[PDB]
């Protein structure tokens, strides 16, 4: 539906939507920008990520509320409405995954871009895994795992330990271990190792880069504090 709008206007409108806290509009503007076929810049990748994280984050928060009510209840209304929210959540994850496969990831050659898009791929499969049941489920979990693993492998080869995308990738992969893969020891190991290697590289950073890195290091510390 955004086919007739200039790319630069879609980007501009995404930034306006962010200021207005209109995250569904923001995501639609950014989907239209991706669909122009050109690679995204660093700033544009961030707008894409912020938009969908806010949209799916509202759906997930609602799903958790409804699932909690459903589990305490265990007529069809609670289950039906939880299913409705779940289906819409699945649709947004499928949209993001579709953008990544057609054709963001295949054109992303630089480490910063490729790691960012593989992290996103792991995050949206993880969101699908949060609601999945059975073994359909196992392949979804392994898809999240595989995307995170490839991103980790590139990030370790190509980025400093303080790089914010590397740090956020590790943070999210460690959550994946803790709550999706039933591997809390792996989650704790990964968060600790990541925190420690970033600490030892802070000395190389400017004041601004230090601020960016320590912000995500604090989220790693928050998780280790909760989990140990």
């Amino acid at each position: 539906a955004m086919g007739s709008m200039e790319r630069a206007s879609l980007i501009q409108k995404a930034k306006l939507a962010e200021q207005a806290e209109r995250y569904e509009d923001m995501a639609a503007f950014m989907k239209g920008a991706v669909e122009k076929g050109e690679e995204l810049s660093c700033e544009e990748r961030n707008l894409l990520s912020v938009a969908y994280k806010n949209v799916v984050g509202g759906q997930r928060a609602a799903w958790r509320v409804l699932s909690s009510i459903e589990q305490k209840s265990n007529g069809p209304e609670v289950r039906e409405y939880r299913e409705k929210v779940e289906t819409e959540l699945q649709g947004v994850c499928d949209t993001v995954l579709g953008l990544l496969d057609s054709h963001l990831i295949k054109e992303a050659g630089d480490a910063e871009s490729r790691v960012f898009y593989l992290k996103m791929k792991g995050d949206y499969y993880r969101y699908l895994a949060e609601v999945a049941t059975g073994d359909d489920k196992k392949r979804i979990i392994d898809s999240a795992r595989s995307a995170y693993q490839e991103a980790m492998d590139i990030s370790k080869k190509e980025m400093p330990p303080t790089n914010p995308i590397r740090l956020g990738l590790a943070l999210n992969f460690s959550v994946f271990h803790y709550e999706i893969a039933n591997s809390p020891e792996e989650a704790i190991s990964l968060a600790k190792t990541t925190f420690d290697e970033a600490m030892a590289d802070l000395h190389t950073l400017s004041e601004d880069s230090y601020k960016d890195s320590t912000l995500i290091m604090q989220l790693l510390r928050d998780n280790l504090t909760l989990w140990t």
């Binding site: 995050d123 956020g168 943070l171 999210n172 959550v175 803790y178 709550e179 995500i216 989220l219 790693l220 928050d222 998780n223 909760l226 989990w227």
Partner: peptide, 6 residues
């Protein structure tokens, strides 16, 4: 607290 992701 709920665990952090980013």
């Amino acid at each position: 607290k709920r665990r952090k992701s980013v």
